[PDB]
From a paper:
The human pathogen Mycoplasma genitalium, a member of the pneumoniae cluster of mycoplasmas, binds to eukaryotic cells by means of its adhesion complex, the Nap. This complex is formed by two heterodimers, each consisting of proteins P110 and P1401–6. In addition to their roles in cytadherence and motility, P110 and P140 are immunodominant proteins and constitute the main target of host antibodies during infection. Here, we address the structure and mechanism of the Nap adhesion complex and reveal an intricate interplay between P110 and P140.
Using a sample of P140–P110 complexes, with the complete extracellular region included for both subunits (P140 residues 23–1351 and P110 residues 23–938), we performed single-particle cryo-electron microscopy (cryo-EM). We obtained a map with an overall resolution of 4.1 Å, although non-isotropic. The P140–P110N X-ray structure could be fitted as a rigid-body without modifications into the P140–P110 cryo-EM map with UCSF Chimera16. Therefore, the structure of the P140–P110 complex found by cryo-EM corresponds to the conformation of the X-ray P140–P110N structure, where access to the sialylated oligosaccharides binding site is occluded. In the P140–P110 cryo-EM map, there is no density for the C-terminal domain of P140, whereas the C-terminal domain of P110, which is absent in the P140–P110N complex, is visible, albeit with a weak density. This indicates a significant flexibility of the C-terminal domains with respect to the bulkier N-terminal domains. In the P140–P110 complex found by cryo-EM, the interface between subunits spans 2758 Å2 with 30 hydrogen bonds and an estimated Gibbs free energy of –20 kcal/mol, resulting in a 100% probability of the formation of the complex (PISA server). The interface between the P110 and P140 subunits, defined as tight in the cryo-EM structure of the Nap, is the same found in the cryo-EM structure of the P140–P110 heterodimer.
Residue numbers in the entry: 27 to 118, 121 to 255, 261 to 412, 416 to 813
Amino acid sequence: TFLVKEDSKNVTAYTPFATPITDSKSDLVSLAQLDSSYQIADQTIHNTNLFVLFKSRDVKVKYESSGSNNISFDSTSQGEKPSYVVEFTNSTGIKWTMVKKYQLDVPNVSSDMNQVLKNLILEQPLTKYTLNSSLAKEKGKTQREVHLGSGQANQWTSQRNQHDLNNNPSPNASTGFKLTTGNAYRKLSESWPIYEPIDGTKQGKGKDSSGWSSTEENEAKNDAPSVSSGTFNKYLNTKQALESIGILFDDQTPRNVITQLYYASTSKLAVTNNHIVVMGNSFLPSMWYWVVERSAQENASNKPTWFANTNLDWGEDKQKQFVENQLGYKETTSTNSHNFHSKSFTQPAYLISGIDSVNDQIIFSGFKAGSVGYDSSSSSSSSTKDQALAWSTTTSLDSKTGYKDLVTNDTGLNGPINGSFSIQDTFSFVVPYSGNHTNNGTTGPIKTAYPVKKDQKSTVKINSLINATPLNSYGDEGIGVFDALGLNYNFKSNQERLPSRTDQIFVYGIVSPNELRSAKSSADSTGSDTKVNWSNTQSRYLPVPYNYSEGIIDADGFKRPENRGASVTTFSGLKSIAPDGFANSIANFSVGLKAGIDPNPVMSGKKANYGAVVLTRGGVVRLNFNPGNDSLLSTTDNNIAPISFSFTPFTAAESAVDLTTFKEVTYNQESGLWSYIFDSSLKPSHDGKQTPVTDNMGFSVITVSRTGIELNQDQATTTLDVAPSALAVQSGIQSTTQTLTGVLPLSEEFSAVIAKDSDQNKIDIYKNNNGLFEIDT
């Protein structure tokens, strides 16, 4: 029998004949002995029992920079509503009864962690209505402007050696983006605004919470009023959009960053034979995750593990350093120059695609949320004051071809180097040279350095920030756009896309029960921050489709003259033509990670195959694993890109689907097919211009199938050299009128759709032809 979620707290069971079981509508929130403010966040089936995640709309969390126990629930005003994971069972018809109830307590904080948190600042979440221009921030100081000062041009050649930028050919390379304007950056105790600038290069107060609350917020309220009578020339009102992505409010005002971080961090559920795993959502970053031992006592506090303590394998040692060297500045010749890199932490947040389990293994994926240092000096003063220190790390044109050599390239490892370079009859934004290489021949090794002057080394305060997108540098320049859309190509006979290693990074992997026990120990460590190691992980540069932006039509080394023009080179300039329910065409999104075991037989004496699929902006990604080792699939040749990742573009039908309305991902074990359910009723009621939405009705379903030569099929396929892929195709189940309840996969050859057009229910039976549906009236 199949289970259907009637609403935010009720669950109704159906027989395989698409008929509802009488007296089966159960209120699990009531059953779990939880109050009205709670609703079911995620459901999964393990060991035949239903595991349910619950989260309260009434949760309140505080961050107190002083003290030992910094992150805590606000007991005082009935905000001590932690999230719960409950095991339910059938005691027979359908009669649910609670087995175990686990509570997810806030994270513990060390002395070292709290020194980052004290001055940690966070970007306002990205919305359905957020533009390329809202995201855009004013360009920072030039490399020669930081280390040398103003009017120090054509003196670079003689002075670059002292500042340890020996032979560096890019004085004009940007050092980051200014934080005095653009999208709001807030402390964990501070709250985010309902307003978003239309142009971040001009409108906005960035990290200046004080300057916003005193003067700018009032201009914002006047321009972009809630419900319209408003002008909407400088600002967008996204209260409705914010609310639709899980933002909690005190009427009009959103709750502080820490509360939003908690509520969104308890979004997805995975269950193994000994552990329960809880991760965040795709909308806003997750700085932690929960590993709950299923053997935990009735009233015990289950604490999360920080991502800043979970050391991942980025594929290569160099790939990890790239991410870390940009997290902040080291040495701390100041005293309060605390950031993540200095306090010896790793990547602190991820925008989680999802989490699932196969053969007691946990599978995760997501994009790495951008994180960089920033200056907070407050005065003469430092040249980098009120600015983020981020840069492009895209592989140089002169680099060796072959995946391993492209990703290990020392281009932009310690400091910035990319810009704009004229090559023959075209151009590039990536530095043409690395090592001893120059146009004349060999000139001595090229050096890079963190954008901090060595004279101002002591009188500088480099603290930490976290972005709401997979973009590290938002500085309004050429290279920013090519790194975001994947428009950097080499010029050698065999073309190759030069990857970035900090911007639009997709991280994925498989976690063992012992790797999860390690994670649990780190959450329970008191005193020192205990470090975790996840071995079977990988990273891949996954950018947004270039054709989602107006003005770009191909991806080649040769670039047309019109493509050096400002209108299609900077963020504010760039215009979106993306149909996937996002106003921006620059930041990538991922959702619906679901793994499944292949029904097709494998060679005798070999373990059954299993993979995972996930949806990203522009296509479907497939994660390939070796079942004999329960590791990521790999191959002998390093020149070929990790065979554990595959990407297949979408067509106009799949691109048309609003990725922000993802409801549920299912997998049919007998078919080997994934059903991606999108409910249009998950749309916000009003635009950024407060105009009522008129397309929040209906649904859509996408089928995902395995393609390619699969492992251990025969004697030849015992090893692979090509990554097996996936295919996303609009199933044929869709509506613009009906409001979906759920989809019953009645059989391999049949499916049932439960919906309401005018309150009364309707059961639609569709004919299934290996993933392709046509209605049976």
